[PDB]
Amino acid sequence: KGPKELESINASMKSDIENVRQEVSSYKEKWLRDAEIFGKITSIFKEELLKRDG
Amino acid sequence: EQYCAPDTDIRGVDAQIKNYLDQIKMARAKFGLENKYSLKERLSTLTKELNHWRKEWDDIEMLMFGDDAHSMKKMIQKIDSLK
Amino acid sequence: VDILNQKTITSEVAASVTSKYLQSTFSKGNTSHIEDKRFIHVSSRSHSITPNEILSLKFHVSGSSMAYSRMDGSLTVWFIKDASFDKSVEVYIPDCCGSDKLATDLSWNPTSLNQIAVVSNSSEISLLLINEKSLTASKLRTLSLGSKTKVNTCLYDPLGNWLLAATKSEKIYLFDVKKDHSSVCSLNISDISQEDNDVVYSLAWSNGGSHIFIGFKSGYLAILKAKHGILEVCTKIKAHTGPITEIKMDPWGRNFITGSIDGNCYVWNMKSLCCELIINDLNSAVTTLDVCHLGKILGICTEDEMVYFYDLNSGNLLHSKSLANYKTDPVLKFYPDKSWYIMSGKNDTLSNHFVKNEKNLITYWKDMFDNTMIEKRRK
């Protein structure tokens, strides 16, 4: 290839790593944001869950 | 442009090509190796782990604000219509 | 002699080469039938008939994947890396966009290498990935909005920067692609067409990706901007006396082509936005319409069940095949990277594709020149 193209290929990948790393941890936060509010009845429902099973 | 400008030796500028002709693959093997696999496999696993936590988060957002907690609300007015 | 006189491609030596390329692509060794699931089902009932026409056929912009949706059932996604069409089905999905409704339109994603957006007729757009190793098709998301009645068409931007989903009665939606698939704007069709209760038949994106062409039932043609999030109407010209069936674009960005339900097909240039050439096609209603990738062949297929092949610079006829004994709605489609085409309908509702050994017309003229030159270097 050409070095002025490879400079534009290699720098485009470096910006894409700065995009996907940022956008993964946006989903890693919102899945823990769903986790702190799901245990308001479900953990109590878990006490209703195991004693109906066991 | 230095072959035609006056007062220069020819063999002294023919050696500026051998400098230039080897500085053109010392910058084509520096972006042809760091772009080969060290930045390929950084985008291999990271695009799989983006898809998983976009798919699996699409289901827990579907349970909370969705057709389980909406179907808990639609059944109770089906009771008092009969009662 | 007349080959070796001109050494660059002129206006006349181009129109004589492209009439030999279309003549030699209808031959016996230059056609093969796609080993579909319906080609298996038809060949059993014909050796020892329920019609299901195809509803869309789309190519990936790289030219390496081809998906299409039959009437009753399934999607089918083929994968062609280089082997002509006998390489691999990867997937086919019998309940693709749900198990209740049909799959009307399709669009590939230009940015991502493997992702479709299948639109049902209910209210929901299901984006799904086609897996490369295993033969499965897993979903990615499912979009929806408020006051969403029935979506028919979806189109991706040719830069992969927007998504346009449209109803034919109520509204038109834009979804941004870069940040997240979120609604940016919404326009009521009554503001676009002020005359009557019109029904949107066809849509197209321009080659840049900043204007949208909309074709109505009354024959109006609306051109409306999409700058960042605004969706406003620029012009409104009355083109035909009938529903505008299909809209195409030149691949060199010079002109665009419209067809209608009268025997009428114009070529409008894109600078001055006036009609430039008129094809005298007084036979029937044009159904499908497409151009090449060099931008020279124009394939018209009317409701007389006959296909034609024109030029775009002139309006002269190159070839004409009549396919009258079939009961198809036959679909022409040209490849996006090489100059082959896939004409639908071989027996009942099928798909053949017409090949050569050379890819382009330019590497065909360049081989005809070098075979003649040997004879002049022989004498």
Swiss-Prot record, chain A:
Subunit: Component of the THO complex, which is composed of HPR1, MFT1, THO2 and THP2. Together with SUB2, TEX1 and YRA1, THO forms the transcription/export (TREX) complex. THO associates with DNA and RNA in vitro.
Q: Please give the name of this protein.
A: THO complex subunit MFT1
> Which gene codes for it?
MFT1
Q: Which organism is it from?
A: Saccharomyces cerevisiae (strain ATCC 204508 / S288c) (Baker's yeast)
Q: What is the additional note? A: Present with 5910 molecules/cell in log phase SD medium.
Instruction: Specify the superkingdom.
Output: Eukaryota
| Subcellular location, record wording | Nucleus
Role description: Component the THO subcomplex of the TREX complex, which operates in coupling transcription elongation to mRNA export. The THO complex is recruited to transcribed genes and moves along the gene with the elongating polymerase during transcription. THO is important for stabilizing nascent RNA in the RNA polymerase II elongation complex by preventing formation of DNA:RNA hybrids behind the elongating polymerase.
Swiss-Prot record, chain B:
Q: What does this protein do?
A: Component the THO subcomplex of the TREX complex, which operates in coupling transcription elongation to mRNA export. The THO complex is recruited to transcribed genes and moves along the gene with the elongating polymerase during transcription. THO is important for stabilizing nascent RNA in the RNA polymerase II elongation complex by preventing formation of DNA:RNA hybrids behind the elongating polymerase.
The stretch of residues making up the signal peptide is none
* Protein name (Swiss-Prot/TrEMBL): THO complex subunit THP2
Where in or outside the cell is it found? Answer: Nucleus
Remarks, miscellaneous: Present with 2840 molecules/cell in log phase SD medium.
State how it assembles. Component of the THO complex, which is composed of HPR1, MFT1, THO2 and THP2. Together with SUB2, TEX1 and YRA1, THO forms the transcription/export (TREX) complex. THO associates with DNA and RNA in vitro.
Tell me which domain of life the UniProt entry assigns to the organism this sequence originates from: Eukaryota
UniProtKB/Swiss-Prot annotation, chain C:
Check the record and name the InterPro entries matching this protein: Tex1/THOC3, WD40/YVTN_repeat-like_dom_sf, WD40_repeat_dom_sf, WD40_rpt
Function, as annotated, reads:
Component of the TREX complex, which operates in coupling transcription elongation to mRNA export.
Which compartments is it annotated to reside in?
Nucleus
Q: Give the family from UniProt.
A: Belongs to the THOC3 family.
| UniProt protein name | Protein TEX1
Domain of life, source organism: Eukaryota
- Major location (coarse): nucleus
Q: Which GO terms of type biological process are on file?
A: mRNA export from nucleus; transcription elongation by RNA polymerase II
Assembly description: Component of the transcription/export (TREX) complex and the THO complex.
The Swiss-Prot or TrEMBL record annotates one GO molecular function as: mRNA binding
GO cellular component terms given for this protein: THO complex; THO complex part of transcription export complex; transcription export complex
The WD repeat units are at 49-88, 146-185, 195-234, 239-278, 281-320
Q: Which Gene3D superfamilies match?
A: YVTN repeat-like/Quinoprotein amine dehydrogenase
Keywords per UniProt = Nucleus, Repeat, Transcription, Transcription regulation, WD repeat
